[PDB]
């Protein structure tokens, strides 16, 4: 499977870090704090390949974690799910682990495949959880930059 390692960063220059075992948060990092940003293993997978929508699966390197979309109060939410490392990564991954990589401008979105109109989002305020945001045009940051690592 075609998969590369990289770091994500929202439009407002907020990096993504681990906050406990099963949560990401987005805060500004400076100097050696920047070392602590999480490296994603974005696996390119099969799915509905529209104009700008490339389907992908975001994993956390050597932690055996993948970002999954699931319901709680009939409301889709972002959660980091444990995975068998000898099985994954895979071509035909389950729709809860699948995000549409939208290049809407020269910015990257990440829409949920299983839950349309629900995008990987961050808050304005520093050091708040990464979640799934139900709007594109709201009070939340749905647009990200990408920095490739190898």
């Amino acid at each position, epitope marked *: 499977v075609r998969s590369l390692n990289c770091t994500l960063r929202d*439009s407002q*220059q907020k990096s993504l870090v681990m906050s406990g075992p099963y949560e990401l948060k987005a805060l500004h990092l*400076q100097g050696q704090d920047m070392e602590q940003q999480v490296v994603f293993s974005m696996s390119f997978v099969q799915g509905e390949e529209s104009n700008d929508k490339i389907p992908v699966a975001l994993g956390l390197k050597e932690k055996n974690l993948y970002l999954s979309c699931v319901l709680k109060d009939d409301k889709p939410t972002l959660q980091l799910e444990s995975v068998d490392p000898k099985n994954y990564p895979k071509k035909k991954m389950e729709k809860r682990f699948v995000f549409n990589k939208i290049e809407i401008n020269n910015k990257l979105e990440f829409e949920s495949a299983q839950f349309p109109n629900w995008y990987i989002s961050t808050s*304005q*305020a*520093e*050091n708040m*959880p990464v979640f799934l945001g139900g709007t594109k045009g709201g009070q939340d940051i749905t647009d990200f930059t990408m920095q490739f690592v190898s």
Partner: antibody
Amino acid sequence: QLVESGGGLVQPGGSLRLSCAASGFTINGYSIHWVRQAPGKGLEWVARIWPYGGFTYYADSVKGRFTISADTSKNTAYLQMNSLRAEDTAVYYCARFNGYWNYIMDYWGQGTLVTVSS
Amino acid sequence: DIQMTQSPSSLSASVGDRVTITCRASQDVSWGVAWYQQKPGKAPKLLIYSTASLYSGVPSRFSGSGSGTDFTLTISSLQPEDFATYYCQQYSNFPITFGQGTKVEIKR
């Protein structure tokens, strides 16, 4: 309430440690920001620390020279100031910040006057 | 370092009047704008956070609106205790930056 101490008059090149003691909440759940106001000018953002993570971020005018820290056991935040300049003369405020509960520098200390002069 | 150009420098208006303070950004800060009220020789007080959201305990006569780059603080009816300088802030991008403030002085 956030109560500051440590201010006063100091030689150029000198050192001064400012404290920000918190009452009525634990600083562990917040960031503590430091904001200075030069005599008769506006507000300038100095630095902030998340005590929990130990994450620090400095303005370019104080990076290297100033060190922000926190002792969660003393529910207190610090700004250690070194190589002080006439330019660092200001009232220094500390303020709390938490996004998840809409505490957007909602509490500020009384402020403490730091005069840098020979 | 995102510049927060605040207008005007100072203003005056009579008790009960309607005045709006305007704050413009050097680049897009999204919805990460707050408004602070500082009385002479005292610590700033939070009024508006997240462009439009009013902080608990603030009179409803205080409201704010934004458009990514252009943000307005608006006060419908001036009360007595509003002899204050008003600062805009952006906290979406670090370093955090403030406007130079607007002093509002009650007319007689």
